[PDB]
């Protein structure tokens, strides 16, 4: 799916764990009300924007791991709907057989 689109996903994920899941303190408890309700929170709402436009966990598209498809994704397998069927008929997804109820 256009090689550079695969690279956008792998840069976004490296820059998000560079800053966030540690530098969430600016919104984690700086934006909730106690003695920090003065201009310090207002300094946070502005300081949270100078970190790069990436770095946020809500800009990851979650593509398929082999083909890079943006649609038809399944979080349980990490593959697109095409690749889970292509790989389930060969017996390579464990325990995943055809359901009949």
């Amino acid at each position: 799916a256009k090689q550079s689109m695969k690279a956008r996903e792998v840069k976004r994920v490296a820059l998000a764990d560079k800053y966030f899941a540690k530098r969430a303190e600016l919104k984690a408890i700086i934006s909730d009300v106690n003695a920090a309700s003065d201009e310090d929170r207002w300094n946070a709402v502005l300081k949270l924007q100078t970190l790069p436009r990436d770095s946020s966990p809500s800009r990851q598209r979650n593509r398929c791991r082999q083909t890079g498809r943006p649609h038809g994704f399944l979080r349980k397998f990490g593959l697109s709907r095409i690749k889970v069927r292509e790989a389930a008929m060969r017996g390579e997804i464990p325990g995943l057989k055809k359901a009949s109820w």
Partner: protein
């Protein structure tokens, strides 16, 4: 009409899975992808080693790969050098230490993967596709199969309009779930494009 995949419908009936591990939803996609990497590497490296099937099994947090092969002396090598120039790279792809095991396919002429790879190499060598087709059907029935079918597809002999030609012998009951049907697929890359090959081999019921 479109047919069901004869291996997927028989999983847990007469056909086993090629992966035998357990995971929760946390490590399912990582075990599933890293098995794609270990399978992709072992197919590229054992290319002329006539490899049929790669069985991956994970104990507590190790992985061990069992390779079914027709030419085991080439996969092990001289002194046992290429089983661990294989296992220091498999353990680096899976992230856990590896223990490669090597099996045998005694008659490679009754394996759908090995029979399908024989036609693809010959079709890319510019061999008449009929003789490649009829030799695969003939060699299988003289070794005790109750049926075989082979099928080639797409621009046969460099023709502009593609055709599919198939040749059957014996008995291939794909609608019977008890039938031990061995089926696999291969692709030949020629100067006029891709020719797909499909092989069904029937070996008996139950």
């Amino acid at each position: 009409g479109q047919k069901v995949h004869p291996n997927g419908i028989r999983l847990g009936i007469v056909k086993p899975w090629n992966s035998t591990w357990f995971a929760n939803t946390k490590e399912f996609a990582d075990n599933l992808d890293s098995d794609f990497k270990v399978r992709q590497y072992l197919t590229k490296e054992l290319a002329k080693a006539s490899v049929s099937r790669i069985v991956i099994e994970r104990p507590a947090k190790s992985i061990r790969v069992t390779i079914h092969t027709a030419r085991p002396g080439i996969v092990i090598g001289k002194k046992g050098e290429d089983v661990e120039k294989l296992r220091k790279v498999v353990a680096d792809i899976a992230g856990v230490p590896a223990q490669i095991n090597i099996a045998e396919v005694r008659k490679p002429e009754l394996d759908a993967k090995l029979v399908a790879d024989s036609i693809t190499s010959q079709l890319e060598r510019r061999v008449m596709f009929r003789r490649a087709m009829k030799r695969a059907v003939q060699n299988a029935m003289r070794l005790g199969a109750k049926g075989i079918k082979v099928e080639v597809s797409g621009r046969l002999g460099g023709a502009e309009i593609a055709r599919t030609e198939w040749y059957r012998e014996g008995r291939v009951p794909l609608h019977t779930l008890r039938a031990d049907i061995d089926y696999n697929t291969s692709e030949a890359h020629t100067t006029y494009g891709v020719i797909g090959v499909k092989v069904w081999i029937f070996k008996g019921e139950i």
